[PDB]
Amino acid sequence: KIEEGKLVIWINGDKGYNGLAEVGKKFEKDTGIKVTVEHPDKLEEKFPQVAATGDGPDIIFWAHDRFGGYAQSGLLAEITPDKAFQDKLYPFTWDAVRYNGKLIAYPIAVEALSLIYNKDLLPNPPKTWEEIPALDKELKAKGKSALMFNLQEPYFTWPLIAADGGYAFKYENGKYDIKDVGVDNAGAKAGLTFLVDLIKNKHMNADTDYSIAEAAFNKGETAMTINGPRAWSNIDTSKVNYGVTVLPTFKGQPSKPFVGVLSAGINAASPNKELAKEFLENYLLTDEGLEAVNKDKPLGAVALKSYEEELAKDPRIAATMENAQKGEIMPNIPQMSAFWYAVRTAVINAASGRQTVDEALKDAQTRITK
Numbered sequence: 344k345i346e347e348g349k350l351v352i353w354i355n356g357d358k359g360y361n362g363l364a365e366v367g368k369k370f371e372k373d374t375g376i377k378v379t380v381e382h383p384d385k386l387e388e389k390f391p392q393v394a395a396t397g398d399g400p401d402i403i404f405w406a407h408d409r410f411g412g413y414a415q416s417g418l419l420a421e422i423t424p425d426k427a428f429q430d431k432l433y434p435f436t437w438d439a440v441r442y443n444g445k446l447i448a449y450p451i452a453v454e455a456l457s458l459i460y461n462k463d464l465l466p467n468p469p470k471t472w473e474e475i476p477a478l479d480k481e482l483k484a485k486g487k488s489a490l491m492f493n494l495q496e497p498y499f500t501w502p503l504i505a506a507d508g509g510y511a512f513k514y515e516n517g518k519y520d521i522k523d524v525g526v527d528n529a530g531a532k533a534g535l536t537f538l539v540d541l542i543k544n545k546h547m548n549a550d551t552d553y554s555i556a557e558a559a560f561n562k563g564e565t566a567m568t569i570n571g572p573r574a575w576s577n578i579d580t581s582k583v584n585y586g587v588t589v590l591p592t593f594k595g596q597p598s599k600p601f602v603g604v605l606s607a608g609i610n611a612a613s614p615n616k617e618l619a620k621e622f623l624e625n626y627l628l629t630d631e632g633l634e635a636v637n638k639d640k641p642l643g644a645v646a647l648k649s650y651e652e653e654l655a656k657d658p659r660i661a662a663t664m665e666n667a668q669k670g671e672i673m674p675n676i677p678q679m680s681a682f683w684y685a686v687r688t689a690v691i692n693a694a695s696g697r698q699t700v701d702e703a704l705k706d707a708q709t710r711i712t713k
Contacts, residue, residue, distance in 0.1 A: 344397050347614040349377045354404040356382040362639030366632045370622050394418040397612040401619050407439040407604040411675025414442040420609040421445045436646040439604035439672045441517035448606035449623050450646035455667035456571050456600040462584045464566040472593040479546040492569035493553040497686040502598035504534040511682050512674050521678050527708035536700045539693055549694040572643040587659035590666055597669040685710040
């Protein structure tokens with residue numbers, strides 16, 4: 344079982360665990376309670392196993408979407424922040440950590456795709472998707488293209504498909520309706536049709552994947568790309584003069600990227616729930632706590648309003664948050680696995696003309712509501 348009188352934390356190795364350890368030393372300094380930060384391999388797979396037998400960490404950090412399944416098995420304790428604490432974070436981040444009306448984690452950081460552009464090839468980035476075909480024509484006249492991004496993964500193409508009314512599952516009051524899916528409505532067909540037109544008209548290649556898009560942008564061959572905070576590091580080494588901005592609108596509607604919220608959940612089997620609540624609310628979720636983590640490895644945009652206002656002095660963070668506020672929180676329900684699979688197939692089939700847009704989306708919708 345889990346030991347009383349200490350805190351064990353699991354967080355992924357690509358996060359600022361040395362910075363989190365420093366927040367834990369301040370907590371120990373104040374309380375005498377020792378905090379241990381670990382970053383085990385495949386911790387998101389291990390957690391459900393060890394937590395099922397009342398073991399594991401007191402606190403686990405992960406993207407909010409995995410927590411729906413954890414909470415389904417009763418592996419997470421319901422949290423109880425007061426209204427005053429809740430107000431210190433962006434309201435939309437709390438929606439990401441509700442499972443069947445219960446708050447099951449604390450929101451830490453927010454991730455969403457943004458439009459990344461080469462300031463040298465483009466003085467001002469396009470504000471709409473519709474003007475991209477013409478812009479590509481101007482740039483092709485000089486051996487460059489307008490836009491290259493990963494078309495193989497629905498995570499990347501979804502912002503455009505959803506822009507005019509598409510949605511994964513309907514959400515109402517901390518709950519999703521698994522029978523109300525917006526994959527084959529008029530808005531989703533409009534968006535995927537637009538995407539297919541870009542491919543037919545040779546403004547983009549259907550086989551463009553993550554590594555192809557990144558290489559082209561970082562080599563200066565394409566004016567724009569669509570990517571998240573994790574990409575900036577390779578661009579910075581490439582020394583391309585880039586900007587990060589709000590995604591283009593489609594049909595006058597904002598692009599709707601999926602929002603991922605890094606969250607901290609408390610093991611239901613933990614005998615240290617009060618200690619975990621004190622650590623999270625009063626040590627980690629402060630400007631000083633988040634700064635310590637961020638200084639180790641940047642979090643991106645954060646759910647804490649006060650610290651986010653300081654971070655947003657960096658335009659790339661500001662844009663990340665702006666796209667997140669216009670985005671679609673990623674559903675934390677198990678049915679999302681049917682969605683990823685079906686939509687990946689629908690997009691690839693419609694892109695290669697194997698199937699028409701109507702038929703590909705019709706099939707996906709059926710398959711997801713099955």
